[PDB]
Amino acid sequence: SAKDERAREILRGFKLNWMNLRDAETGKILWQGTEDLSVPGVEHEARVPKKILKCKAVSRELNFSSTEQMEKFRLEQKVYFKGQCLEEWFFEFGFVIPNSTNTWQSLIEAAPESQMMPASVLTGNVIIETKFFDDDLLVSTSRVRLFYV
Numbered sequence: 001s002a003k004d005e006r007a008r009e010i011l012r013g014f015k016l017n018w019m020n021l022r023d024a025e026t027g028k029i030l031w032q033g034t035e036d037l038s039v040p041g042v043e044h045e046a047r048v049p050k051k052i053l054k055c056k057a058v059s060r061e062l063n064f065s066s067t068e069q070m071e072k073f074r075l076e077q078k079v080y081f082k083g084q085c086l087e088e089w090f091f092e093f094g095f096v097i098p099n100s101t102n103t104w105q106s107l108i109e110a111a112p113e114s115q116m117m118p119a120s121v122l123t124g125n126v127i128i129e130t131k132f133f134d135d136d137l138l139v140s141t142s143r144v145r146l147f148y149v
């Protein structure tokens, strides 16, 4: 379909350039990287400080480029622990100018009344599954395994 083709065109023109995570309360940088963790078809890995689990809220900056125009660029993310979804997050960027580079800031807030498992239990057992969309059009699905260090 035309939609299938457009999804592949968007992915072809997309790159995640850099990303970081901060403690939202204190502003302290917890993690940064310049690897495109959204590339599909390989299992990515990331090592995050275990103190992230004690943060009430984490702020993320995600810098991306896109050759293609999008009307409603958005993400869905699922936190999987040993194959079970523990949390689902939704974030919207909106309109993307063709051939633009953009920094997208999002807030990841603790769900009540969730409590974090110990880092030692979680480490290597958490997969983040991320789906990019333009509106209802699925552009890519990618996975990252987390280690708490």
Ligand SMILES: CNc1nccc(CN(CC2CCNCC2)S(=O)(=O)c2ccc(S(=O)(=O)N(Cc3ccc(Cl)cc3)C3CCCC3)cc2)n1
Binding pocket: 016, 019, 021, 031, 037, 038, 046, 047, 048, 052, 053, 054, 055, 056, 057, 058, 060, 062, 077, 079, 086, 087, 108, 109, 110, 114, 115, 116, 117, 122, 126, 128, 130, 144, 146
């Ligand atoms: C019961 N729920 C539960 N249990 C364990 C872990 C978490 C998820 N954690 C975040 C919260 C923060 C608020 N309260 C404490 C935990 S997390 O620290 O493991 C986490 C997970 C994913 C992300 S992410 O989606 O921003 N991101 C994954 C990611 C981001 C963007 C894209 Cl395109 C792809 C992957 C990466 C983390 C390492 C590199 C960046 C941030 C933080 N949730």
